[PDB]
């Protein structure tokens, strides 16, 4: 509720296995929420991908998502450092919802069906020797 | 090759200090020398500054002032504290070598080093080279005019 959307991409349709989902990507700008509650009274741009759900219960995970940010709130204030990724989703009608998709989805099945192999592997191919600064870096984000 | 001393790898250390053992072994001029005792004392304080620098903030690159280097450093604070316990053992032991032939000059060279303003600010802190300058002078002394000539 904090963007307002500007455009879709007429090309980016592409359903999924399932009930009949699919997924959408748009073109967005970011403004606030004063500003936009202002500005839909008279009338930093990304791209942003959206997945709807029919026929599917929305609600645990708002418990599962609220107790996520509550507990970041908590570690951030602490001044921790711990990472999380709290996605948004809204359920709108019975059965019925919209789930964001993080940036650059990456599937861990997905990975293994093409590797076959531990993810040490996957991980020396793609930064290199454990004696680089960049598979140090990756290792702290990871423990992080 | 005192620069390439601290290589982070494990055999480039080593034939660095070959290489370093025999050029000083075949020109010993070279330990009276008034620019390679300035530098050792640089790379020595910024080894000891580095001791302690927040390991998990990222950039352990560090510049070498009044020489145009860098140094890497590793990540656990094991292997700096063994790095530069090892380093600390080769300036003590040039320091030796040199005093032992020519006293004069080299104590000249030291009493000139310790005359510099920008180091009278850090002092008061630890400053590792001062320290290390200031101690190396005494063990090595020899006797004076008066006292050159006596039997025990």
Not at chain 1, 67 to 84: E, T, W
Not at chain 2, 50 to 76: C, G, N
Not at chain 2, 121 to 134: D, E, F, I, K, R
């Given at each position: 509720?904090?963007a307002?959307?500007?455009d879709?991409?007429?090309?980016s349709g592409?359903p999924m296995?399932?009930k009949?989902?699919?997924?959408?990507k748009?073109?967005?700008?970011?403004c606030?929420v004063s500003?936009?509650?202002?500005?839909?009274?008279r009338?930093?741009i990304?791209?942003?991908?959206?997945?709807?759900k029919v026929?599917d219960?929305?609600?645990?995970?708002?418990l599962?998502?609220q107790?996520?940010?509550?507990?970041?709130?908590i570690?951030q204030?602490?001044?921790?450092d711990?990472?999380?990724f709290?996605?948004?989703?809204?359920?709108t009608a019975?059965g019925?919802?919209v789930?964001?998709?993080?940036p650059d989805?990456t599937?861990?099945?997905?990975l293994?069906?093409?590797?076959?192999?531990g993810?040490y592997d996957?991980?020396?191919?793609q930064?290199?020797?454990e004696?680089?600064?960049?598979?140090?870096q990756?290792?702290?984000?990871?423990?992080? | 090759?005192?620069?390439?001393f601290n290589?982070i790898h494990?055999?480039?250390?080593?034939?660095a200090?070959?290489?370093?053992?025999?050029?000083?072994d075949?020109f010993?001029?070279?330990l009276?020398?008034g620019?390679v005792?300035?530098?050792?004392?640089?790379?020595?304080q910024t080894?000891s500054?580095s001791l302690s620098?927040?390991?998990?903030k990222?950039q352990?690159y560090y510049?070498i002032?009044d020489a145009?280097?860098?140094?890497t450093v590793?990540?656990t604070?094991?292997?700096?504290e063994?790095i530069?316990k090892?380093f600390?053992?080769r300036?003590?032991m040039?320091?030796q070598?040199?005093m032992?032939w020519?006293?004069?000059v080299t104590?000249?060279?030291?009493?000139?080093?310790?005359?510099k303003?920008?180091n009278?600010?850090?002092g008061?802190?630890?400053?590792?080279?001062?320290?290390?300058?200031?101690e190396?002078?005494?063990?090595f002394?020899?006797?004076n005019?008066?006292?050159?000539?006596?039997?025990?």
């Amino acid at each position: 509720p904090e963007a307002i959307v500007l455009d879709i991409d007429y090309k980016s349709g592409t359903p999924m296995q399932s009930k009949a989902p699919y997924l959408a990507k748009f073109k967005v700008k970011r403004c606030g929420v004063s500003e936009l509650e202002k500005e839909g009274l008279r009338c930093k741009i990304s791209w942003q991908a959206a997945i709807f759900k029919v026929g599917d219960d929305c609600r645990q995970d708002m418990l599962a998502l609220q107790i996520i940010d509550l507990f970041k709130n908590i570690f951030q204030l602490v001044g921790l450092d711990l990472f999380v990724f709290p996605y948004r989703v809204v359920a709108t009608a019975p059965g019925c919802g919209v789930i964001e998709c993080i940036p650059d989805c990456t599937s861990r099945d997905q990975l293994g069906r093409q590797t076959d192999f531990g993810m040490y592997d996957y991980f020396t191919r793609q930064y290199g020797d454990e004696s680089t600064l960049a598979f140090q870096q990756a290792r702290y984000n990871f423990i992080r | 090759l005192l620069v390439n001393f601290n290589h982070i790898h494990k055999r480039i250390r080593r034939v660095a200090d070959k290489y370093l053992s025999g050029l000083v072994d075949k020109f010993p001029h070279l330990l009276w020398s008034g620019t390679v005792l300035k530098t050792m004392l640089d790379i020595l304080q910024t080894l000891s500054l580095s001791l302690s620098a927040d390991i998990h903030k990222d950039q352990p690159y560090y510049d070498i002032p009044d020489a145009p280097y860098r140094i890497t450093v590793p990540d656990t604070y094991e292997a700096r504290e063994s790095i530069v316990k090892d380093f600390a053992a080769r300036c003590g032991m040039i320091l030796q070598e040199a005093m032992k032939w020519a006293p004069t000059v080299t104590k000249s060279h030291l009493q000139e080093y310790l005359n510099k303003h920008q180091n009278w600010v850090s002092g008061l802190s630890q400053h590792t080279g001062l320290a290390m300058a200031t101690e190396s002078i005494l063990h090595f002394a020899g006797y004076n005019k008066q006292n050159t000539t006596l039997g025990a």
